[PDB]
Symmetry: C2
Subunit: 130 residues, 2 copies
């Protein structure tokens, strides 16, 4: 299984992203179980909206309708763990969505992330490469 | 009676923000009932962590512990309402967090927002000023 982060969705959903081709390659080779979070989709919307405008962002909104991609609603319990995690890990700059993403992966026993730019790698997960 | 957006927290939590002065004055004259959301606090963490560093971002994390600020966990239902709203409103660039913020306010019957930049005003709310 894999967990998909915003950095990946943003690449996949933006044809003008420098890592678009890499993303599509990764997407074609993905395992059957693909999950992400409500926080990630929201972040993806915002990023794609700011970068490519409303139409491109609508694509991200539609992922929540997918029968193939599993979207975890991050619970209050999981968020509390993410907050605690965030407060202790001052060694590197981590976003809130990243911390909730790590928390989801730990909960679901997921080690592989579809993500770029090394934050998941730094946090002890595997950022899948083509 | 008021909902506090990310833009306000970011100004209040960063003394170098151009609207920090306005934020503190509004914060001094705020009503007894003050509300925000998990999404907003998460976004605030991320912004402050990038701009001012870990120690400053921890302040935002601590708001979730407040006995005076009500922190609403945005339900999957409210997010769905936010998603449908986002898809509908192409006339202006709206973030996901702001969309969920609008949804929370509408459900709670709140129109007065502690927020800057006019996005809440555009969405039909009152961005309160001193």
């Amino acid at each position: 299984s894999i967990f998909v982060a915003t950095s990946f969705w943003a690449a996949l959903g933006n044809a003008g992203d420098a890592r678009h081709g890499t993303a599509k390659r990764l997407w074609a080779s993905k395992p059957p179980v693909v999950m992400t979070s409500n926080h990630v989709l929201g972040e993806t919307w915002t990023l794609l909206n700011r970068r490519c405008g409303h139409r491109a962002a609508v694509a991200a909104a539609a992922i929540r309708l997918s029968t193939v991609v599993r979207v975890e609603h991050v619970t209050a319990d999981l968020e509390e763990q993410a907050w605690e995690w965030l407060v202790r890990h001052d060694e590197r700059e981590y976003s809130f969505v990243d911390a909730t993403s790590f928390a989801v992966m730990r909960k679901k026993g997921i080690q592989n992330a579809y993500a770029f730019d090394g934050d998941f790698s730094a946090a002890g997960f595997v950022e899948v490469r083509p």
